[PDB]
Amino acid sequence: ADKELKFLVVDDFSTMRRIVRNLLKELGFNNVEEAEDGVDALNKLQAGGYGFVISDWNMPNMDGLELLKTIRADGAMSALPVLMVTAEAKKENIIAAAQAGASGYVVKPFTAATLEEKLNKIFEKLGM
């Protein structure tokens, strides 16, 4: 993985988006854009050029699972890595996300080390 990989951080809370953006910055990942819900995110991904998506599970209008299913069904982006963020792990949620294509899942709040760990595990699983 290239430090210039372009990330899309999706959440309806601007403070959480700021947190994620700062943790990526601490790891050396500075090309970050933000979206406020699943629909806003698709508007942006359509622009093209993204390399990785971090999305919260709970968002209005289009939630995390709906955004992920849409990305996996799209011919041009079907392989984009998606890391799902959630406030609480639930077995069913983890299986539904995995079966729909999620590259990994992380429970918030998390630290830079934990994010780094998640990113490395995905990079390794995907051969990046």
Only one residue has tokens 């890391």, namely: 83
40 labelled ligand-binding? no
113: Cβ–Cβ under 8 A, 6 or more apart, which residues?
Answer: none
Peptide bond into 109 cis (omega under 30): yes
Query: Structural domain tally of the chain?
Result: 1
56 labelled ligand-binding? yes
- Tell me the residue range of the domain where 122 lies: 1-128
11 labelled ligand-binding? yes
What's the CATH number where 17 sits? 3.40.50.2300
- Residue 72: alpha-carbon gap to chain centroid: 13
Expt. technique: X-ray
22 labelled ligand-binding? no
C-alpha–C-alpha distance, residues 67 and 30, integer Å? 23
Resolution (A): 1.7
C-alpha–C-alpha distance, residues 37 and 23, integer Å? 20
Q: In the sheet that 7-10 helps form, which strands lie side by side, from edge to edge?
A: 32-35, 7-10, 52-56, 82-86, 104-107
Q: What is the radius of gyration, based on Cα positions, of the chain?
A: 13
Helix/strand/coil (H, E, C) string of the chain?
CCCCCCEEEECCCHHHHHHHHHHHHHHCCCCEEEECCHHHHHHHHHHCCCCEEEEECCCCCCCHHHHHHHHHHCCCCCCCCEEEEECCCCHHHHHHHHHCCCCEEEECCCCHHHHHHHHHHHHHHHCC
